[PDB]
């Protein structure tokens, strides 16, 4: 809600975080939130030397997930949804 | 740089004129909006090293104004 | 401190507070002479203390203290062995054994001490704690007569695997110390190769390699078959079997030791490459593993074995060139290096060369340079491979301009080796039409210039090549022989040092001249030395060093003549005076001679510091000419006198060489200067500066100026770097540094934006590369950021040397244009 309020007023948002920790959970919640919030236009930048490595490692460790999310390996689908953020060019890692 | 035409952009560059010609680039901050009087005063350092204030203190006037983009964004944010 | 530690340990609570105090005390170092008292107190508190952790920490600390400086621990080993005998707990016993090991290693020349140490290690070798046995075996390994092998050998059957590893390591360390192990250790180690723990197997294969190298030609009989086999071949088979071990670390070790042995028979060497003495297909399985580290070890092993055996190298050629397709970067670099190493004993085949060419498409700089060196050393048998190499090299010429140098050199070496293969390809490359005069190719085209370099290095050995040259080919040859004589070979179609010494002697002898004559002579000699530095390369350092010294002297005498032009203090005019500027200039030049040159012995450092002292005196006098305050004058005066005193202290052995110098006459009247008024001090300082003698500068045998050349940004003909507003732009910096002994701590990169802001950068040691002696290569990125600009200005980037603080530029400034456009 705070970052949506800041973005709506034209400001920027800075989110200091580790490249592979709680970033994924809040990224999922942001993916859910922006669609209802009407903020799909704004970019989601993720800058780190190990950014692409973090995203790929999070994706490939699908059997290390709970039953709900490891069930995505039966049918062809990556577990985490930020692959869809990348596909629709919402998340941009550098 | 003197505003409201006071010495806000002091900078110096000692350049060696090769064939009686010298050139250099200067970078002038204008963060404070308003009117700025830029002055450039040439000085001459002779072979021994003594500094002479010879060249003209020619001045130009700069009208610094906030861009439409930032103005509109700040107005919308404040309103 | 001794008594402080004693009382603090007495008053502290036993379990935790004493432990914390010992923890604090262990960090801070202890002076050598005071070690005896503190260890005595620690021993007393060890006797008092009942807690095991505190006693353990006391043992660890008093073992640490035995490593401090040149302290002699022969007086603290009787109490140590006593408390070790009296100690009950296993951790404290092991730590005390560690302390005893430290004391023994501190006194290796002492024999009786080491016999006592090994005796007490043997005594506690039967303890139920594996740690105690480990430390006892470590003592027996580091310390031991050179019986001990049997004692250590007995513990190859110990139930604890880590005790077995400790015993094997102890035997290995005994061998490294110089002991000749017995052949009986081989059978004991052979049993350990089937252990269920990877560390035991690794140590066992190390030990079996050692014993095979010690007794290679000894005969060992096979148990079942009645066959007599040399020990080295049997060990070769055993290690080869270990290349299939489940753990990858044992496989890496096995491959390395397989590389290290070369006394093995030829047929055994051939067996490891055939499909189907359990050494069949050992390298075949050892070259295609999942782990890259075992593959690197096998590649290096193949290198050593092929260097020992050219016949083996012929078989290894296809296996090693197939490895080039491996997509691990370090693996392919090591394969390149090994292939270059075995290049003298081999010659590549048609299909093997086709294989390596089809996967020769490299991108990064290091792999490309390694390939260039390999092609420099390579040997090929087909001209079609030469054609394909030319095609790939011209592709890498049009793709990478900065690769031109190494590819020109590459083809220079490639043709010199293969003239016969280039001879059909010569009209294939020169585009010589049979019955038409062809157009004259662009003499600036690097690809074409490299085709000529190749064809001319080949022509050197091949009379038949001069025939097939066209008219423009002869014309182009005549040019590149003059312009590029280091690449193109010839075809079949001292006064400087004497002048330097003479000029310096001329300056030194004529020190009785009037000031005008003296300074014009100095100007003449400075100009001469600068020109001589410009001409000669080797004497550039000496000429610039001497010219800097003479420029310091010229500035000094000019400032003193200005002082002669100067008058009473309140009438002094700042705008017309240049003595303070002269003092600052002498300051910076003295720093330049101290640091920006190499090969500077102390006999030059004393003269540099003497000129520095003269400059400081000149600055003091010039400041006194202006300041009406008495307290600052006193402050600078006593600072200068302290500097003089420090100079006298540091260079006390060099004063007899400084006869009639400023500092010598200053030291003559030392206490009077100490107790005189500041105005009187300034006056006598001026008079003594004017009457001082010019000190001879003893030239070093070898000295070179510290030079640097920025090459990657190049001239400003490139377009501006855009899209930088607020954010960062990375500018890649490449530079060659000449004759800088310690560039990492001293070389810095300065960035000057078009405003007054200046940035200072301290490159990490990983940026610096050392391809040659006194010739470094700095590759790094410097990050630039600034707000938006209306027009693309240029930012000056320069390399500076740092000294200890303060910095001095030593590279030519370059400029690059940046357009930080907003968005």
What can you tell me about this protein's structure?
Chain A: This is Integrator complex subunit 9. Chain A: It comes from Homo sapiens. Chain A: It is found in: Nucleus; Cytoplasm. Chain A: Belongs to the metallo-beta-lactamase superfamily. RNA-metabolizing metallo-beta-lactamase-like family. INTS9 subfamily. Chain A: Component of the integrator complex, a multiprotein complex that terminates RNA polymerase II (Pol II) transcription in the promoter-proximal region of genes. Chain B: It is found in: Nucleus; Chromosome; Cytoplasm. The structure is cut from a larger assembly and holds chains A (94 residues), B (79 residues) and C (823 residues). By secondary structure, chain A is mainly α. Chain A contains five helices and two strands. Chain A is globular, with a radius of gyration of 14 Å. Chain B has 79 residues and is an alpha+beta fold. Chain B starts with a strand and ends with a helix. Chain B is 14% helix and 23% strand. A three-stranded antiparallel β-sheet of chain B has the order 1-2-5, with no helix packed on it. A two-stranded antiparallel sheet of chain B has the order 3-4. Chain B is built from one helix and five strands; from the N terminus they run E-E-E-E-E-H. Helix content of chain C is 58%, strand content 8%. Chain C contains 37 helices and twelve strands. In chain C, strands 4, 6, 7, 10, 11 and 12 form a six-stranded mixed β-sheet that branches. Chain C has a four-stranded antiparallel β-sheet with strand order 3-5-9-8, with no helix packed on it. The two termini of chain C are 66 Å apart.
């Amino acid at each position: 809600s705070n970052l949506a309020l800041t973005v709506r007023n034209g400001g920027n948002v800075l989110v200091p975080c580790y490249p592979s920790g709680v970033i994924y959970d809040l990224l999922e919640c942001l993916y859910q939130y922006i669609d209802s919030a009407g903020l799909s236009s704004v970019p989601l930048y993720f800058i780190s030397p190990v950014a692409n490595s973090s995203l790929e490692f999070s994706q490939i460790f699908a059997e290390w997930l709970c039953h709900n999310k490891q069930s995505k390996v039966y049918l062809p689908e990556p577990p985490f949804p930020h692959a869809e953020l990348i596909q629709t060019n919402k998340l941009k890692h550098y | 740089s003197t505003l409201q035409s006071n010495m806000t952009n002091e900078m110096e560059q000692r350049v060696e004129p090769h064939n009686d010609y010298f050139s250099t680039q200067f970078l002038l901050n204008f963060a404070i909006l308003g009117t700025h009087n830029i002055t450039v005063e040439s000085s001459v350092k002779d072979a021994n090293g003594i500094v002479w204030k010879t060249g003209p203190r020619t001045t130009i006037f700069v009208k610094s104004l906030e861009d439409p983009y930032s103005q509109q964004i700040r107005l919308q944010q404040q309103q | 401190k001794s008594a402080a530690l004693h009382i603090d340990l007495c008053k502290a609570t036993s379990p935790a507070d004493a432990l914390q105090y010992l923890l604090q005390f262990a960090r801070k170092p202890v002076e050598a002479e005071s070690v005896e008292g503190v260890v005595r107190i620690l021993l007393e508190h060890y006797y008092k203390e009942n807690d095991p952790s505190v006693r353990l920490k006391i043992a660890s600390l008093l073992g640490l203290l035995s490593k401090t400086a040149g302290f002699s621990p022969d007086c603290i080993m009787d109490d140590a062995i006593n408390i070790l005998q009296n100690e009950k707990s296993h951790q404290v016993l092991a730590q005390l054994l560690d302390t005893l090991l430290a004391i023994g290693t501190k006194l290796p020349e002492n024999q009786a001490i080491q016999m006592r140490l090994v005796d007490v290690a043997c005594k506690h070798l039967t303890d139920t704690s594996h740690g105690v046995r480990n430390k006892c075996l470590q003592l027996l390994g580091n310390l031991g007569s050179l019986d001990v092998q049997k004692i250590i050998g007995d513990y190859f059957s110990d139930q604890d695997p880590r005790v077995r590893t400790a015993a094997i390591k102890a035997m290995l360390q005994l061998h490294e110390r110089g002991l000749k192990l017995h052949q009986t250790i081989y059978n004991q180690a052979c049993k350990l190769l089937s252990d269920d723990y990877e560390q035991v197997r690794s140590a066992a294969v190390q030990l079996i390699w050692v014993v095979s190298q010690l007794y290679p030609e000894s005969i060992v009989p096979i148990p079942s078959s009645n066959e007599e086999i040399r020990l080295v071949d049997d060990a070769f088979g055993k290690i080869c079997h270990m290349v299939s071990d489940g753990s990858w670390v044992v496989r890496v070790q096995a491959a390395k030791l397989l590389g290290s042995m070369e006394q093995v028979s030829s047929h055994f060497l051939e067996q490891t490459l055939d499909k189907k003495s359990g050494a069949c297909g050992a390298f075949v399985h050892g070259l295609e593993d999942e782990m890259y580290e075992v593959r690197i070890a096998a590649v290096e092993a193949l290198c050593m074995l092929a260097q020992s055996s050219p016949s083996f190298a012929e078989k290894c050629l296809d296996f090693l060139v197939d490895m080039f397709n491996d997509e691990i970067e370090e693996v392919r670099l090591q394969s390149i290096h090994t292939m270059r190493k075995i290049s003298n004993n081999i010659t590549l085949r048609e299909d093997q060369l086709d294989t390596v060419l089809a996967v020769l498409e490299d991108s990064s700089r290091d792999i490309r340079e390694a390939l260039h060196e390999l092609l420099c050393c390579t040997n090929v048998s087909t001209k079609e491979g030469i054609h394909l190499a030319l095609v790939e090299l011209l592709k890498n010429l049009t793709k990478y301009p900065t690769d031109r140098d190494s590819i020109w050199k590459c083809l220079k070496f490639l043709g010199s080796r293969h003239p016969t293969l280039v001879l059909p390809l010569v009209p294939e490359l020169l585009s010589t039409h049979p019955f038409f005069d062809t157009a004259e190719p662009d003499m600036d085209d690097p690809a074409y210039i490299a085709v000529l370099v190749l064809i001319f290095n080949a022509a050197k050995t091949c009379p038949t090549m001069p025939a097939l040259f066209s008219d423009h080919t002869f014309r182009h040859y005549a040019y590149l022989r003059d312009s590029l004589s280091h690449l193109v070979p010839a075809l079949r179609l001292d006064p400087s040092q004497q002048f330097l010494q003479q000029s310096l002697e001329r300056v030194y002898s004529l020190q009785h001249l009037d000031p005008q004559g003296a300074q014009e002579l100095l100007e003449f000699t400075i100009r001469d030395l600068q020109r001589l530095g410009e001409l000669q390369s080797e004497l550039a350092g000496v000429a610039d060093f001497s010219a800097t010294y003479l420029r310091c002297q010229l500035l000094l005498i000019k400032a003193l003549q200005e002082k002669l032009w100067n008058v009473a203090a309140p009438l002094y005019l700042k705008q017309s005076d240049l003595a303070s500027a002269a003092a600052k200039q002498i300051m910076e030049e003295t720093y330049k001679m101290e640091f920006m040159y190499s090969g500077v012995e102390n006999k030059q450092v004393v003269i540099i510091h003497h000129m520095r002292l003269q400059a400081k005196a000149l600055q003091l006098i010039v400041t006194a000419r202006t300041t009406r305050g008495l307290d600052p004058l006193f402050g600078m005066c006593e600072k200068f006198l302290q500097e003089v005193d420090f100079f006298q202290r540091y260079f006390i052995a060099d004063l007899p060489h400084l006869q009639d110098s400023f500092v010598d006459k200053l030291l003559d009247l030392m206490p009077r200067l100490m107790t005189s008024k500041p105005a009187e001090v300034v006056k006598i300082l001026q008079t003594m500066l004017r009457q001082s003698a010019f000190l001879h500068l003893p030239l070093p045998e070898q000295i070179h100026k510290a030079s640097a050349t920025i090459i990657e940004p190049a001239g400003e003909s490139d377009n501006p770097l855009r899209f930088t507003s607020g954010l960062v732009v990375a500018l890649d910096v490449d530079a060659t540094l000449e004759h800088v002994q310690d560039p990492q701590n001293t070389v810095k990169v300065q960035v000057l934006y078009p405003d007054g802001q200046a940035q200072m950068i301290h490159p990490k040691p990983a940026d610096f590369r050392n391809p040659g002696p006194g010739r470094h290569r700095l590759i790094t990125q410097v990050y630039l950021s600034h707000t938006a600009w209306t027009e693309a200005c240029q930012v000056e980037v320069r390399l500076l040397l740092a000294y200890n603080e303060g910095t001095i530029p030593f590279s030519k400034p370059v400029k690059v244009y940046i357009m930080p456009k907003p968005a």
